[PDB]
Amino acid sequence: AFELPSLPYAIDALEPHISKETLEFHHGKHHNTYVVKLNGLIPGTKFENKSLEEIVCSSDGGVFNNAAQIWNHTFYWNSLSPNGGGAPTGAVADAINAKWGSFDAFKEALNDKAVNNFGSSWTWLVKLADGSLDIVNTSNAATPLTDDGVTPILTVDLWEHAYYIDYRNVRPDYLKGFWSLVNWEFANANFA
């Protein structure tokens, strides 16, 4: 059966951007629930002995919602670090300048995509077939993991549980937090 991965850092490590309480609900409860629900839908079925990724790339309805959500959250914990934040570095820093002209223009373009991402959703930094970086929004459990030629680089969870405890309704406050946490090492790893 699938397991809930351990968080890549201590539960208070993202303070004060993301609270210890948010992490216990978000990772300990929400992410956990997608794991048990998936574990509850696959016994006996054809997805029974497939990896998480084979499942999200070949499933539907409830099996897809849960498997994609487990995958999205794991990627999300990885896009954050108590050692991240600030200016981008390496390959991704230059790729960002190539597409948007400057990091600041990129921040503004992602923030705009994120605040207007209606309902439960995800905003992704992705690498396209032509080697270039782009920003795409998915809704509910959808993920670019399933689009040919699109490689997920970083993600920001915009479902309301991702920030309500800490920022209530103001997404820009949450996004300011994200930027202080962005894991550029994870980004560069996915990009290369």
Added chain:
Amino acid sequence: AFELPSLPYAIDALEPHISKETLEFHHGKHHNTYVVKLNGLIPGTKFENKSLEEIVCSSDGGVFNNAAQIWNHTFYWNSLSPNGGGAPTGAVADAINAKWGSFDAFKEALNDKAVNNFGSSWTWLVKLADGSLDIVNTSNAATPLTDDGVTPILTVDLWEHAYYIDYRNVRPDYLKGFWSLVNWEFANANFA
């Protein structure tokens, strides 16, 4: 320009089922924002002189998400009451018995529709063209108001901001509060 309607009861009137703070943010901020946004989008478009309902029934993209959310939230506040809850009465009570056999079968049916309504969404009690009752789910800003010959009777908001402050991730606890606040008079007024 559209206006945020007043809450139909005091900000603490739904306690201990839905808190003063949820009402302050849910009505005071979330609902308001849909109003400001919609007002921001109408000038220079055909929706220039239309009624809220005319817009939601003939709109698309952003004009629709904002207008429908205003309509939906107005409908939701009316669907609760410091004096609701408990058993259904009058015509609605009997139609529920006609369709589901018992109030309890109906309640279990709606809870199941609601807890499984994935992402931001609404679970609705509607009166169909053939006169009978049914339960339908909509996602994000969708609403039965646009379904021809389908009459909205009661709704429960399942976007996370509707309950996260008071119940975090557990929708069933939120649903317990909803059944303690159901406004059967509004349901009967809408059904009649």
